[PDB]
Amino acid sequence: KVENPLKSLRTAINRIVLVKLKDGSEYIGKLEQTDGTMNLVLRDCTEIREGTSEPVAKYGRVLIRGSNILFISVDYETV
Amino acid sequence: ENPLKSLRTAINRIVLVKLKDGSEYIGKLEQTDGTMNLVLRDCTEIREGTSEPVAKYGRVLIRGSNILFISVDYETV
Amino acid sequence: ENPLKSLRTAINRIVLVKLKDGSEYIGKLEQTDGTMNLVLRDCTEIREGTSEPVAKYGRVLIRGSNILFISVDYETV
Amino acid sequence: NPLKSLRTAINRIVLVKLKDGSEYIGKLEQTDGTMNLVLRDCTEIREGTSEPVAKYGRVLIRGSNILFISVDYETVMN
Amino acid sequence: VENPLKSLRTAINRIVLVKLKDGSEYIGKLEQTDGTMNLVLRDCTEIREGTSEPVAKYGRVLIRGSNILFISVDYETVMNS
Amino acid sequence: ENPLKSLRTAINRIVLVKLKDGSEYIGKLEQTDGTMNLVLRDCTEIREGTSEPVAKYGRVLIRGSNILFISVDYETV
Amino acid sequence: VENPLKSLRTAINRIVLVKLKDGSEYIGKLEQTDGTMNLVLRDCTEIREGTSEPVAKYGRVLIRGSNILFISVDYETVMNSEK
Known part of the structure; x- marks a missing residue:
């Protein structure tokens, strides 16, 4: 099947991601919706x-x- | 399952709106585009x-x- | 519903306008767009x-x- | 509507404030x-x-x- | 009358001044605009x-x-003062 | 002849990405569009x-x- | 005589200067444009x-x-002051 950046965003549903906005701020949450x-x-x-x-x-x-x-950490793992 | 009807479900509730300014606002959401x-x-x-x-x-x-973002259920207290 | 109709209801009243640089402006609304x-x-x-x-x-x-935003019903004085 | 209010001040002095907050005046010729x-x-x-x-x-x-345009500058003369 | 772009297009082969978003200004001889x-x-x-x-x-x-930010289309007349 | 078709020649390679923050990031490029x-x-x-x-x-x-710009192959060696 | 974006393509293989909105200037030899x-x-x-x-x-x-912000096409000769 296909693989594109935006599809990889759609596959991260129901998992924990980090989102960094343009102000420099970073928010962790359980991804539920995308578009x-x-x-x-x-x-x-x-x-x-x-x-x-x-x-x-x-x-x-x-x-x-x-x-x-700015970006989205698709699968955020703390190690 | 659209990111926007999650917004329009939050009408009549207290929301948090953050802007690029880092400015945060809180109020009862009425209408939504x-x-x-x-x-x-x-x-x-x-x-x-x-x-x-x-x-x-x-x-x-x-x-x-x-x-920046909208906390749709900002009765988070 | 429609948020911009809420702007045509403030005409011939005083509103507060917050611009992107953060500066605020009061004045009486006449025309919109x-x-x-x-x-x-x-x-x-x-x-x-x-x-x-x-x-x-x-x-x-x-x-x-x-x-940034427009304070539509700036009675609050 | 606003952008015809602008044309009221043709050949008249307006004030224009840009995003960086610098203000400029001059006689408005043309708009769009x-x-x-x-x-x-x-x-x-x-x-x-x-x-x-x-x-x-x-x-x-x-x-x-x-940021904004004061179309009725030049009455700020008064 | 009017069409702001036209005043730019008649400024070719003239000395202009361009103020950019970074807040800096430059001068030069205009040659192509769109x-x-x-x-x-x-x-x-x-x-x-x-x-x-x-x-x-x-x-x-x-x-x-x-x-x-803007373009001064007759800047030679300005620094001719 | 196309600037973007130079980007896809860097997949599986290490590139450097400078965002408008000025912040720069290294990483193995996997996917582009x-x-x-x-x-x-x-x-x-x-x-x-x-x-x-x-x-x-x-x-x-x-x-x-x-x-801002993608160093479409950071050969630092 | 012609069109701005096209004058950028007559600069291929030249040393050009590129200034970004942040203000940082970069020098390199131009390859491909659009x-x-x-x-x-x-x-x-x-x-x-x-x-x-x-x-x-x-x-x-x-x-x-x-x-x-801008692109200084053929920037090479514009290195009089130094090198």
């Missing part, structure tokens, strides 16, 4: 700071605007 | 943690173009 | 947080793409 | 749907005053960078 | 507060119209 | 001149509209 | 303000036309 424009819907969204033991704020269920995203 | 244009009843700007209320704007119309 | 191009009267710039006019501009055509 | 303007005798005046900074002559201002 | 306000200038040099300096020569440059 | 969206494996953030990584993000989807 | 001003460069070297002194080597880069 072509990269509009995300996440569950248990938590802002984090790199370094640090992850969370610094919780936002619950969040609709993210694809226009403002 | 496909380009994520927003109207909020009782929209008070809140700093992050802080104190919360910073400025009370009443009913605001928010351009969708300038939004 | 699809691109949220606004025309205000007695428009005075006020500084972030306060109600103090630091500059008055009179009748002002505002470009819509540079607007 | 994206608010691309043409001004004569363009100057930088400094905010609050009408004391020039830089003269620029006839200028074409790209519309997307415009 | 509908997207893309500019081709000769003898381009960065520009200042008053008269006009030669801070940095960039020669023959193509200027992407999407990042231009 | 016409919008210059990229998928990197072992995406790590770097500071030019230094050896230590700023952050590890693993397999990353990079949105194409926020990229 | 309508949206997307570029491919060899010898891509970031140079410091106005000078011709290298600060970072990037080799072959695909540059996004969206983020360009």
Whole structure:
């Protein structure tokens, strides 16, 4: 079957991803929805700071605007 | 399962709207457009943690173009 | 529903406009537009947080793409 | 509608504020749907005053960078 | 009357001034423009507060119209004062 | 003759991506498309001149509209 | 005489300067171009303000036309002041 960047976004549904917006902020959540424009819907969204033991704020269920995203960590693994 | 009807399901509830400014706002969502244009009843700007209320704007119309994200169920307390 | 119809209901009233640079402007709304191009009267710039006019501009055509939000029902005084 | 309010001020002085917050005045000649303007005798005046900074002559201002345009400057004369 | 792009198109073979989004100004001799306000200038040099300096020569440059604040189409008349 | 068809010659290779943040990231390019969206494996953030990584993000989807330039083969050897 | 984007294609194999919106300048030898001003460069070297002194080597880069301020076509001869 096919493989394209945007399909790989659609395959990350129901798993834990990191989204980095353009302001430099990073939010971890359980990916639930996507679209072509990269509009995300996440569950248990938590802002984090790199370094640090992850969370610094919780936002619950969040609709993210694809226009403002820099990248998406498709399968975020803490090791 | 569209990312947008999740938004329009959140109408009549209290939402958090963050903008590129890092500016966060909280208010009862009334109306919603496909380009994520927003109207909020009782929209008070809140700093992050802080104190919360910073400025009370009443009913605001928010351009969708300038939004980072929207916490659709921001009765997260 | 439709968020921009909420803009045609503020005409001939005072509104507050937050622009992208963060500067705020009060004035009386006259005409509107699809691109949220606004025309205000007695428009005075006020500084972030306060109600103090630091500059008055009179009748002002505002470009819509540079607007953060519009406080539609700025009675709240 | 707004963009015909703009044409009211043809051959009259308007004030234009760009995204970087720099303000410019000059006599409006020509406009279009994206608010691309043409001004004569363009100057930088400094905010609050009408004391020039830089003269620029006839200028074409790209519309997307415009914060606002005060079409009825020159009545701020009063 | 009117069509802002036209005043740009009659400015060919003239000395113009371009203020870009980075906030810097340049002068040069205009040579090619299009509908997207893309500019081709000769003898381009960065520009200042008053008269006009030669801070940095960039020669023959193509200027992407999407990042231009404005263009002064008769700048020679200006620095002829 | 096409700038983008030089990008797809870099798949499975290590490239450097500088976002508009100025922030730069190295990683094995896996997937691309016409919008210059990229998928990197072992995406790590770097500071030019230094050896230590700023952050590890693993397999990353990079949105194409926020990229400055792609070093479509970082031969640092 | 002709059309801006096309004058960019007469600059293939030349040393050109590219300034991005952030303000950083890069020097390299132009390979491939398209309508949206997307570029491919060899010898891509970031140079410091106005000078011709290298600060970072990037080799072959695909540059996004969206983020360009300008392109100094044939930049080679424009190295009078130094080298």
